[PDB]
């Protein structure tokens, strides 16, 4: 009686556990699952910004070589101009 009741409450909770065990195996998958999403929405945003930063540098790096080139030429012309402006005194002198 008291013995038999015990023998069975043991059985009754032996189940409630087996069912707790289950609800865990579950929740543990639903999470490892929802972390895969959150993991992609990060894997994503990163890719983008890696580009956005890669663009930014490359663009600006290029623009500068251009601006550089323009100035390199603008220099040579300025030199040649110095010479002339000066040959314009050797024609007034």
């Amino acid at each position: 009686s008291n013995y038999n009741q015990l023998k069975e409450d043991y059985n009754t909770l032996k189940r409630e556990l087996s069912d707790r065990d289950d609800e865990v195996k579950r929740l543990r998958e639903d999470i490892a699952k929802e972390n895969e999403l959150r993991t992609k929405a990060e894997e994503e945003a990163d890719k983008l910004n890696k580009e956005v930063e890669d663009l930014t540098a490359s663009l600006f790096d290029e623009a500068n070589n251009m601006v550089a080139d323009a100035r390199k030429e603008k220099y040579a012309i300025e030199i040649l101009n110095k010479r002339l402006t000066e040959q314009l005194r050797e024609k007034d002198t």
Binding site: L48, E62, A63
Partner: protein, 171 residues
């Protein structure tokens, strides 16, 4: 300093998607990154029917790299030009495709436009009627031109402009 309008050019290489812009915009100083970056952006204030509107246009080399971004350009386009060369046939074919590609991301409230280009050389392996077919199948207007006459080039854009502008007045 007024009303903006985002426009972009969709199409393959060789099509002369670039040259059309160089030509559409009158600037010799502005640089070209499309050779190096694979992208190039240009503003051009234009008008018709007293409208101070500024056009923003993207030209891309499509190339993989920043595709993650060039892709963000469809998402914003207020109008987009699907372009093809008429001296190359494989050029024509893909248009249904790019069109599909546009419906995917292009917030379809976008003003599309078929554009038969390079009608210069007359290896014209395609005809004006052919192009107006797909255009009618797609439910979008059509035109042609050749940056070797500066003809219809400006039309190409002034067209899109009105179509867009009006699709804004029904609202």
């Amino acid at each position: 300093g007024s009303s903006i309008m985002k426009i972009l050019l969709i199409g393959d290489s060789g099509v002369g998607k670039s040259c059309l812009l160089v030509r559409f915009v009158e600037d010799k100083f502005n640089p070209s990154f499309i050779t190096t970056i694979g992208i190039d952006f240009k503003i051009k204030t234009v008008d018709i029917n007293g409208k101070k509107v500024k056009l923003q246009l993207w030209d891309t080399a499509g190339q993989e790299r920043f595709r993650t971004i060039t892709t963000a350009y469809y998402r914003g386009a207020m109008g987009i030009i699907l372009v093809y060369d008429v001296t190359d046939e494989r050029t024509f074919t893909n248009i249904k495709q790019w069109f599909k590609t546009v419906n995917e991301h292009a917030n379809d409230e976008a003003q599309l436009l078929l554009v038969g280009n390079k009608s210069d050389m007359e290896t014209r392996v395609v005809t004006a009627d052919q192009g107006e077919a797909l255009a009618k199948e797609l439910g979008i207007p059509f035109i042609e031109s050749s940056a070797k006459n500066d003809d219809n080039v400006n039309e190409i854009f002034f067209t899109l402009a009105k179509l867009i502008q009006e699709k804004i007045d029904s609202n």
